[PDB]
Amino acid sequence: FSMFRYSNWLDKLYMVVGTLAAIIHGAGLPLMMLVFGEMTDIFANAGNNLEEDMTRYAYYYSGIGAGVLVAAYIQVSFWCLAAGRQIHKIRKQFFHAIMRQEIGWFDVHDVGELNTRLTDDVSKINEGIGDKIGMFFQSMATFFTGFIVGFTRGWKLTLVILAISPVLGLSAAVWAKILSSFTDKELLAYAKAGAVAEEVLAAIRTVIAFGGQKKELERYNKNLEEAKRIGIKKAITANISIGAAFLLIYASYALAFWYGTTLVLSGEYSIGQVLTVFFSVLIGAFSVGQASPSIEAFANARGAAYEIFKIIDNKPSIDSYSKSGHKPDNIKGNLEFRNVHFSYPSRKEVKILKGLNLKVQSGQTVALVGNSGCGKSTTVQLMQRLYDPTEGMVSVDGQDIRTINVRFLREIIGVVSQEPVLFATTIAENIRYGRENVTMDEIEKAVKEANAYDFIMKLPHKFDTLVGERGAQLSGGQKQRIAIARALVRNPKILLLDEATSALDTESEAVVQVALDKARKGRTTIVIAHRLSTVRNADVIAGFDDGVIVEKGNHDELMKEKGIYFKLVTMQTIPPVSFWRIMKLNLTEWPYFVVGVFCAIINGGLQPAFAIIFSKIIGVFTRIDDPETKRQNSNLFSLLFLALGIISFITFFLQGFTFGKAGEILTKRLRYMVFRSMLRQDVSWFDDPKNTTGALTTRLANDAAQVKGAIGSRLAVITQNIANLGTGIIISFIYGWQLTLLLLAIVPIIAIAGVVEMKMLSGQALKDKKELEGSGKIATEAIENFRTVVSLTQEQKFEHMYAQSLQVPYRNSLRKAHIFGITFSFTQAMMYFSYAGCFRFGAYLVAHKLMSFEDVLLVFSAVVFGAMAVGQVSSFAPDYAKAKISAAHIIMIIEKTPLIDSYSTEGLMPNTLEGNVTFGEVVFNYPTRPDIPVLQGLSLEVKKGQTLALVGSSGCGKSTVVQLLERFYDPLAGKVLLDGKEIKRLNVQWLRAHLGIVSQEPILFDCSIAENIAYGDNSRVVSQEEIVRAAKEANIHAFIESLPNKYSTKVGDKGTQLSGGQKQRIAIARALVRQPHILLLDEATSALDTESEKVVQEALDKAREGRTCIVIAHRLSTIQNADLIVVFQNGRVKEHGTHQQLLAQKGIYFSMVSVQ
């Protein structure tokens, strides 16, 4: 897919013009080097009227700068605008195709995956085609023009530069490869600690229950040691790469200076020519190297566009926009589905429909019979043309469905799904989407027929009542009524209904059925429902069976036949950050960071030191004396450069050595602390979307980088830039004053332009993301419910909505592109203007015999090159704002403290426990939703030698009762006593270790089976004999021994090798290993091999001796086993007492006993 540009051939002229302008701009700079060399030669000759030549050179430079500014502006703006238009066209076409694709194909591919692909690849293509191509062309032009200037300026110097360049290129490539490999290795190494932390967090409930934070922290630290070693190595490698790059650059500078000096002394090209050739060649090589990101983005967008086009270029079997079918004006109710075989493309192995014969008259309430997966919903979908028969025939009114106008059939048909959904728009908006041609009378008619008058009118904006995201403001019955009204709005030739009132209750069932039967003579109504009451009244009823119809006839006939229908009938019967707090790693590298500070100062002086060395070298030729021995002096100066280079390399050898060693350490500290803070966090805090397992893992992982950057690299860059600026400014002021003022007025304008570049880039990215998300809200709303939209056949409406939502920000995108191009051009414009003005005014100054040309050149080079290097260094460090925010969040998390300290030292820990507990007037809903008080003041009391059972409120929050008993949360109200003692005042770890609490679906940590067993209670070693005894007690001795490797075997990811029964048995064995005084099981039975579950329960009852056992199970046996049974209802104990008395009561216990 190399050739990606595919639209607006006329607009392609914009691309051609932009390419030409970029080439002109790129070739401009070598011309700048040539003219600067000529000006330097003129100045040197003056050292050996003058104002006239200086004015001519300044005029040439100013003209070149203005032309380069115009070219840059034109190229940037044109490329950006053309790419934006192309991206808009691509997005529009892509969304059109997606909405026009096949429904079955959409079911084939993930909806979320496709939505993310669109919303991401759009920006990927925009980035890879926006300006990176323009910058690449400009860099190629710079390379070509620099090479041409070098060749036309001299042979020996050009050869030397060409020989120097590829060594630097290869060194840069090797350094980049090493850095990438180191980063990948470090991420892989840290993955172990990341997995450990993720497992701990996900198992947070079990971890807190067992109080095993110590072992997890130890493992995390063990991994973090190697992780920090690798990170320090990688940081040192990156710093050494930068150092070696600078050292090689300086060495090339010194070698070129020596060679040019020798040539000039030998009568070769003048000093100006040699300097121009050298600088032009170096800058061209720099541009060639800097062209890489454009090519990388080109390749990335190439792959993205290949995938996107493949998606778009797909030709769907069912096309919404297609109109090749014949659409008769008069439709008479007549449907035929003969030998209709149909299989889901998602699951092609099984043919859900294996052929059947069925006919449908006109205006007949055809009803379908069959159990789940019998072929009812799929039958309707095939009838609705959502798919086609694998082997069969489908026709309407004596005509094949495919042989008719797809759009007309879709519009003239009505489909009501068992799970109706309304778009996120006002009820009136959704109704209009159902039928725009209603004319405001059909709306009222439907509202009255479906009874959408009271509910519809009640909400604010009776007709225009807005519905929350996904229609969260409407109830199930109201939603079903609205869907029915919307279906009736179209008044289709035929309609189909499923799950009339299968949402919450049959109250709407009566009204819904009455309304549906009110208007059914004029159109055939496919009847689908979960209640035989509605099915009985059907005029015509037919059965389904394994993709075939056997039973048939009305309710009376079906009952007489005593078929499957008769069987069903019988069955019915943003905190602020602290900058100083950031200095918490000083305890590690406070004296160590001094070496890094010294290295940074050394580099920031070396830059201006190189400036001074170059000034001296230039002055050597500028010296009128020009002795032969001056060459030696020149060599001396040249030698200095080489020395400076070494000082650079060693300097880097220190920087990465220090900061790395510092930063990783700090990282480790944070890693040791942040997660530790998470460990000592109340379970209440864990109940929060902000504290999401994935979110917490990402914060822990993608925060060490931010904190380390903000701490180390921010200070490093600040110090380096400050040192460079101070040294340069001081040197320039010492060597002249007026030129110092000129350079100080010139350079900061360029610096401000460079900063504004990044500011505008970030702001534009944010604004583009905002607008794209604005459009994508509606895009996704349509995509997720794609089936409903297709049924409605209103795809054009969503297409128009997306078109408007994209056009509205398209103009803003174009304007931003134009402004950014203008600013980018102005950057180079100011650059060249200042470059020329500095030379002009320095020539004026020296013409007055005030300042020597050598000093002026020194000051100018210092200012310009130092400013450029400072900007590059500032860009080198990652973003401070994002790093600052991440550090603020990490510091807030670490400083966070728990209302109840799980690691608190103090705590009431009497000699033993009374084996009793009491909770009266208990009140605690939850942290997330306090609007639902769960405990309404229940009463519960456990004593010695008694087991408690929970019944009645199977869903009111019984598990919450166990959780609170474990102190997982804090009661909203109600007194609680631990064996007549303050539960809160009790010990922290003592209570956690004492209680053998289990969960519904325990997740076994992916460690050794023996390791999992021993995880029951740390701080007291668990000899393998104890594990064996616990396994024997919990029927796990045979299970553990039979399992390969015996106890040595380790469970996979949450015990993937063993079924849920094995995991439950292992959890029970671990609990028994804990040997708790009091034990609790909460709905761990389920089915889980009913005989096996009963055996496990019997073992537990035999294990309940000398302990208080809490039992929460949905099995009558569990109710019988419990010594004491307490019910729950309305947050209170509806029933309680003995099992015989509870059964005697006519209460929820009686209903459960009878029904169960």
Ligand SMILES: COc1ccc(CCN(C)CCC[C@](C#N)(c2ccc(OC)c(OC)c2)C(C)C)cc1OC
């Ligand atoms: C797209 O990025 C670029 C932007 C502008 C330029 C041209 C810069 N010229 C006006 C010369 C200024 C000085 C210069 C820079 N930058 C520089 C001086 C000293 C340096 O330290 C040794 C240096 O290395 C970072 C670069 C160039 C010699 C490469 C090159 C670019 O490619 C690197």
Ligand SMILES: Nc1ncnc2c1ncn2[C@@H]1O[C@H](COP(=O)(O)OP(=O)(O)OP(=O)(O)O)[C@@H](O)[C@H]1O
């Ligand atoms: N991609 C798929 N592959 C296989 N089976 C699927 C697929 N999508 C849905 N199914 C299921 O296959 C069955 C097809 O039968 P159909 O839905 O027509 O009858 P049903 O008994 O009314 O269905 P359901 O049990 O869904 O209410 C349904 O149970 C449906 O949920």
Ligand SMILES: Nc1ncnc2c1ncn2[C@@H]1O[C@H](COP(=O)(O)OP(=O)(O)OP(=O)(O)O)[C@@H](O)[C@H]1O
């Ligand atoms: N942080 C929370 N905020 C709000 N509701 C929560 C929170 N955590 C859990 N819940 C809800 O509390 C209930 C948990 O206890 P639940 O009612 O399921 O216990 P139960 O009586 O054993 O019922 P069942 O066995 O039917 O699930 C669930 O409704 C769960 O959605």
Ligand SMILES: [Mg+2]
């Ligand atoms: Mg169904």
Ligand SMILES: [Mg+2]
């Ligand atoms: Mg439960």
